[PDB]
Amino acid sequence: MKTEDMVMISIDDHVVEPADIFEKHFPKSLMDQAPKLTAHPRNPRVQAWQFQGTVVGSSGLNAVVSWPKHEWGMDPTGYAEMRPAVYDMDMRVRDMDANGTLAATLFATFPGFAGTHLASLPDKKLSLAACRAFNDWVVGEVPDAHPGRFIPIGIIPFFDADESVAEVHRIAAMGCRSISIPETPYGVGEGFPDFKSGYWDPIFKACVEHNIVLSLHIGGGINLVKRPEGFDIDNMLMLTPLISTIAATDMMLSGAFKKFPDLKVAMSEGGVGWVAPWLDRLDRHIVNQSWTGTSFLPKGMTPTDVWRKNFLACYITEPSGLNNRHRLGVDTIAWECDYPHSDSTWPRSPETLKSELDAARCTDEEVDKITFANAAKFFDWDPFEHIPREEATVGALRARATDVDISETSKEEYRRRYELTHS
Amino acid sequence: MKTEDMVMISIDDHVVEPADIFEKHFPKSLMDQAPKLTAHPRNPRVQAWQFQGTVVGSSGLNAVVSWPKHEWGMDPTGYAEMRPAVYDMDMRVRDMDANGTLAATLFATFPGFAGTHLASLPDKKLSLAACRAFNDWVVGEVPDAHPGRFIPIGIIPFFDADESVAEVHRIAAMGCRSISIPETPYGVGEGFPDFKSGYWDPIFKACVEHNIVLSLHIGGGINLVKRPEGFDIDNMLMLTPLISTIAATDMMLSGAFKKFPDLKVAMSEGGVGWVAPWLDRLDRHIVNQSWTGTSFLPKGMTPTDVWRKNFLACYITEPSGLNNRHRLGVDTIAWECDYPHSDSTWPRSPETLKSELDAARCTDEEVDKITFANAAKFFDWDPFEHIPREEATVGALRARATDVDISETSKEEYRRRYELTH
């Protein structure tokens, strides 16, 4: 197979919500309490969202596409500095065309990719309104404005189980395929109930009823880990995506799959390699403990069986990861772009992934599984409903974007263009 | 190769120090302050070590050898309940013969396998004395009494850098090949200095001068991870050996290999599979950050280069771990028995490992590397100085031990035998 004939669905990307999202979707009677854009306290030159006495904005590692690498950093950033495609979905699909990406899966910024910023705030009626307004935009408006380009994923008001169940039903009917939930809830704020407590069971139940995937995105497990005093960016960047073992262990040992055997879990941005040693240890534990007469799994299943039925490993780039694909089961590995994060392979995702696939001796069947078919089955999404397959390939989408400039562009030049646009 | 013809060195096992260790090795002038046996406050049926107003005993997951599985647990256990081989080194070598194990590497129980129990106590003169007495026993007496069966490994009084350097030099002269140090020092107690701070540099320097390996054994990383209030033994037991990524990242990014290019680090009981995804991310980071003109690594070296020269991955059983052996470099993977821990494969270590090696299509040369030759080279230890190779194989050692009973034996029966004896 040629690079140009790949079909690529990404099951993990990120969106910066545009400035009018709450003007358009917050309840009118609550509008004077809606999230509003203000200058960041540490950067009058960039805006951020003020909500319930808090201000939050985008990190400068999470919207870096096309920036020179020396401009990447932890400091807050904002619309003026960003390539417009990070916040303008009309421009986003053009960047996706240029990268050969058929579909993307948009994790939230302002509410938290798992909704934890809304869950941290004291007025839960206000936080609930903000959750529903966000879902109305990212689940309803965006996928319908760009049919076939976005896999609908939302968040829930997980501080309130009954309201979370209601929201699952509500966004299921809007086409929601996944909800992003905190991967290690006991690590969030003061702590929320863990998966073993039963607190999440009505949410798990409603998701199974709608075939909705739980996306457990990295970023929670790192907050569990004590570090030495001096903040080491490089150390954090190294550990943060390599410890999905914690949340996956929690979910496996919670008994969730014995109670809900059809429950689906995607370990978003977790990579591949962590799975193999973890399954080896779990598999051996179940064998060695079979004398107890019970386990956290449905009867007659090994951990590897449950991996293959209920889990999806998700990765951007990991050349050695595919050397255990037969251990895991090749059906359980899905690619992601992670646009516009520092870890994204944009705008060379096809070439970068194809080189790894070729070095791992992937067959064409395996290429298709990893680049789109595993994700499409797991998220119950038809990639060619709105865009025929011959028009959905890397080569065909790139042919629509020969005019898209993908060269390195300073955040200062985006700012100059932004200031010209808004005067 | 047949099972019987393997040669097996374990670079990670554990010892339960016997009752007379401090009677024999603690300074005579301080004997009234030595650790002394007493009833364990949480289990009066077993003894435990009292030292400086604390009492610590063995865990029932760390001396399980021959017990029925339903008897394994986190309750304290003691001499009376243990198979004698766990604390009696004359019986230990017979259990090693029965398992086909040529050599073992004995991590401590009472001081902490990295000495953190001694470091937690207020009187550091007594803690230093206990450290030196333990090293005298486990580095000096035990390997001398059983030549060729134990790779000498010690601990250090790491609460004091000057005393630690002095002790490295002292135990190096006794044949020490490794020191076990806390893998994540900032998580120990209220926190000790991390590897990046430079505090450990004179210790690293002394180790390199004697070609002594740093053993970073699992168990410290888990104490960094917040858990929910509701405890799940299984959750702890599942996570504890799978997060060696933390301490390895700390050591890699500390700059220690830039300052000490020959420093050697063994990730004891850490498994294998964590390495490949971690090296992929480190290799990528160093490529993508090369514009900075700085690195935590020596010039002209990638993270994979430093892995191959400076690290050893250590594992008991991991059927899928060898599927990235060429990624890592097959010279960097070493087997371990972890006797007498719950994770040990005793008394069928050869059979269990061989099945994994065959399934991974290992060549005879790769078999020899993983079972003994990588460890022997990494720890600069000659496996055939006292025992010729022909007499050192699984089959030859097991022929020494055909009379050794290895059947399941309840801890109540060991207690019956123990109490008759005493």
Ligand SMILES: [Mg+2]
């Ligand atoms: Mg139904």
Ligand SMILES: [Mn+2]
């Ligand atoms: Mn992501």
Ligand SMILES: [Mn+2]
């Ligand atoms: Mn990311």
Ligand SMILES: [Mn+2]
């Ligand atoms: Mn061990």
Ligand SMILES: [Mn+2]
């Ligand atoms: Mn162990």
